Write a protein that binds this ligand. Structure first.
Ligand SMILES: *[C@@H]1O[C@H](CO)[C@@H](O[C@@H]2O[C@H](CO)[C@@H](O)[C@H](O)[C@H]2NC(C)=O)[C@H](O)[C@H]1NC(C)=O
Ligand SMILES: *[C@@H]1O[C@H](CO)[C@@H](O[C@@H]2O[C@H](CO)[C@@H](O)[C@H](O)[C@H]2NC(C)=O)[C@H](O)[C@H]1NC(C)=O
Ligand SMILES: *[C@@H]1O[C@H](CO)[C@@H](O[C@@H]2O[C@H](CO)[C@@H](O)[C@H](O)[C@H]2NC(C)=O)[C@H](O)[C@H]1NC(C)=O
Lengths: 43, 277, 277, 43, 43, 277
């Protein structure tokens, strides 16, 4: 499991709100996946 | 599943992070007078900036392509400040009263210290031509700006010439800025604006400035002397005097576990993050 | 794995969605004459817009930063329209014949009803200066525009002044638009263009307009009165008079299952989507 | 499985085609993952 | 496993470095996931 | 888990890829004189471009919205070049000495062959008005450009008129370019710049150009005749004379396995990629 998603901080301005949202839902997206993947490796 | 952290910011392998306190990246790089703590900064491991730093752009305005500069900052570990156009050298433009109460220093009108706000002299503002050849081994971060007045009268008072421009050329940059006179609500007592621009000048390239008004000239640029893994961390914490191998915005981690729980945005050798409870 | 839906659009917990019919978000907000159904709109749960709504920009042109506005619309549930510059108040500019056959109403030349297309008066177009201080508790969506004529003669006929500008200032916005005379193919019988711009005016801020030609002035802006979870859904369906707790572009879902099959872009309390068969 | 990827509609103009494509392949990407994750939880 | 993430080449200029990075960490992100998913299907 | 490839670039089902050698997409489309190999190109399966192609923009400058054009290129399989403004037709502007040593052909000053660098004639540069109606069944890729001189004297020498513009209109495009005189370091012996622009002209639309200086006029545009699945692959490999059903930047794959190891960016019917060893 050494190669698991690592989130980086990225910054977007007031008119970059769509890609800020795209970025957020991706970082969350991968976190939610690996959370599930570790919880179900245990079980 | 480590759930415990030390609630403070440490060094990262004996390398101290740059903690900006109440200054922003913009205030630091441009030289907000409230940011003298950071005039010359030693090598850093990572950078820490609060959510809403109080001292950012003292004179109201805009830092152009700011987020891309910040991103460019998280693979730099050390700037070395150098003078590229001495304030002393402005023979035909007034260079000593480009100041504002919006930028106080000890309650006196000052201005960002890395750039110079040129003003007319003897009712005249000759065309400015200046070059800097980057005769260093390293890349340079060069910053400059434009002043957007709040009317035709102000324009003519400060700069004489009613219609003005700033052109900046490198081997890749071909810019020609024009001031935008508008009527704006006062921010920090000011309704004028300053807009700032930056470029990386490669070794052996030269930057050429030319203007007939509204020019916020550089004085100091930055030599990018140490490139490497770095980051900008958003945190409210002050410096903790400790040391660590894994740092988070919430606090440092001393742990042996394979996973952790604290905060997704970590730096260093760290356990992997999960949302688990 | 629920595979069944009711094939129509319902309310979302007794809150009726805003169904735009053949109007686009642009046509609604700017006030396309074909969009009077939506002059004043009650609170919505979500918004429905067809793939290619027929009534969008009647006079051909562009809505600047349109997708960012739409994104800003999917966390708003209720606008309340207010007058910020009365059409009555234009003393020195003709304000009643800025109309076009490209924007018909009942087969008569009309124009978007939320903005005013000012024209010269007695062969003159004095400089316009107007302010609106947002003296409301809530954020305001303010819209304005610029007319790009199709030649020097047209420019001079409509606006007298051959060289013109529009400057708009808030505490954050520093804009200065210049009309772009080009030669263009006719869209809706017109080869001129209108370009539209928007800004959110924070409570206690003021917007300042100034122009000497080509200005499409606001009359009505929007008070953002209810913020909350919302969305823009792309669908061809008409209103179904029913109610639901989960809506999709294909139709509503009444189900108990943990998963579903219909359409990935759902709104409300919903089973999770999978591609399975 | 309560915390599984939920797709949002996002819109991009005629000159935003690369990030439209990036967005599409991400939303599909996560859908394809959770489809696989639910089909193989069953099996 | 016929529907598994397929990476596309996308290009970004010198001032598009954030979305270049977002794109890279997404394509890697999904590769790292399916690598893990195939290695652990075997095991 | 296939680990073996043939280390060269093949056809994709008997359709030969377009290998650009040392030319870039920009050099090919604009017609860099070093790129005559590609004046007229047969249908392709995919496109191959080196990391840093040597022949890209011979005269230093910029290709505007270049990455979006490239993306638009990876769902095209065949252009057919057509003349839209014959070089012969420039009656009032010098059209035969817009050349530069930065664009050599056989060691002689030449210039991109798909666009024309107009210059003044008899100390005059009349206003240019030209139209092309796309009377073809297919979309057209039209390219044009602007010359940014390095000073007022150069501007006036080449174009007579000290203040100039280029306006381009379609049914969707409303552009008005203005040359940016700056002082720049020499790239390829030149300190002037050329900036290029493109648009897709839909069937039955018309493009209208108008300028009084600095115009780099089109001569040849591109008919998009075959749309379909395609790609731009970054590779250093030369053509391998073989054939395949799966290609990678490292080499082709002949395999039956479900997975592979080589390179994540493949084209065709391929085993899925994993990082495994
Ligand atoms: C910046 O200065 C350097 C150093 O003086 C210039 O390059 C040198 O000078 C000439 C070019 O005219 C060459 O013969 C040398 O080989 C160069 N030396 C080095 C160390 O590169 C350079 O021309 C100047 N750059 C610009 C952009 O004006
Ligand atoms: C918009 O109007 C408000 C209200 O009149 C102005 O702010 C008030 O007036 C003065 C500032 O000169 C202060 O003493 C009050 O405290 C303010 N009242 C409130 C409720 O904020 C404000 O100056 C105007 N804004 C702009 C941008 O011009
Ligand atoms: C481009 O040329 C076409 C063909 O000549 C023009 O459209 C035709 O002409 C008139 C419009 O005035 C119509 O009655 C025909 O139905 C059109 N024919 C076809 C095949 O479409 C068109 O007007 C020109 N386009 C532009 C943008 O000027």
């Amino acid at each position: 499991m050494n190669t698991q998603f690592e989130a980086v901080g990225r910054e977007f301005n007031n008119l970059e709100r769509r890609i800020e949202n795209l970025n957020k839902k991706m970082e969350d997206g991968f976190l939610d996946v690996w959370t599930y993947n570790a919880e179900l490796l245990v079980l | 599943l480590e759930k415990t952290h030390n609630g403070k910011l440490c060094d990262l392998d004996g390398v101290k992070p740059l903690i900006l306190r109440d200054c922003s990246v913009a205030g630091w790089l441009l030289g907000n007078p409230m940011c003298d703590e950071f005039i010359n900064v030693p090598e850093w491991s990572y950078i820490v900036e609060k959510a809403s730093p109080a001292n950012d752009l003292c004179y109201p305005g805009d830092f152009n392509d700011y987020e891309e500069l910040k991103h460019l900052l998280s693979r730099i570990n050390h700037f070395e400040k150098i003078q590229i156009i001495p304030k002393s050298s402005w023979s035909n433009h007034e260079a000593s009263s480009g100041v504002s109460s919006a930028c106080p220093y000890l309650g006196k009108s000052s201005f960002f210290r890395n750039v110079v706000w040129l003003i007319k002299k003897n009712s005249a503002y000759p065309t400015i031509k200046r070059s800097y050849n980057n005769t260093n081994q390293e890349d340079l971060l060069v910053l400059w700006g434009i002043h957007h007045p709040n009317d035709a009268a102000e324009q003519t008072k400060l700069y004489q010439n009613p219609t003005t421009y700033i052109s900046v050329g490198t081997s890749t940059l071909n810019q020609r800025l024009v001031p935008k006179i508008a009527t704006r609500s006062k921010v920090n007592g000011q309704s004028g604006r300053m807009e700032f621009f930056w470029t990386i000048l490669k070794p052996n390239d030269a930057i050429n400035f030319e203007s007939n008004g509204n020019f916020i000239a550089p004085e100091y640029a930055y030599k990018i002397v140490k490139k490497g893994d770095s980051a900008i961390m958003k945190s409210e914490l002050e410096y903790g005097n400790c040391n660590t191998k894994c740092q988070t915005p919430m606090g440092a981690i001393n742990s042996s576990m394979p996973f952790h729980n604290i905060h997704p945005l970590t730096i260093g050798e760290c356990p992997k993050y999960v949302k688990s409870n």
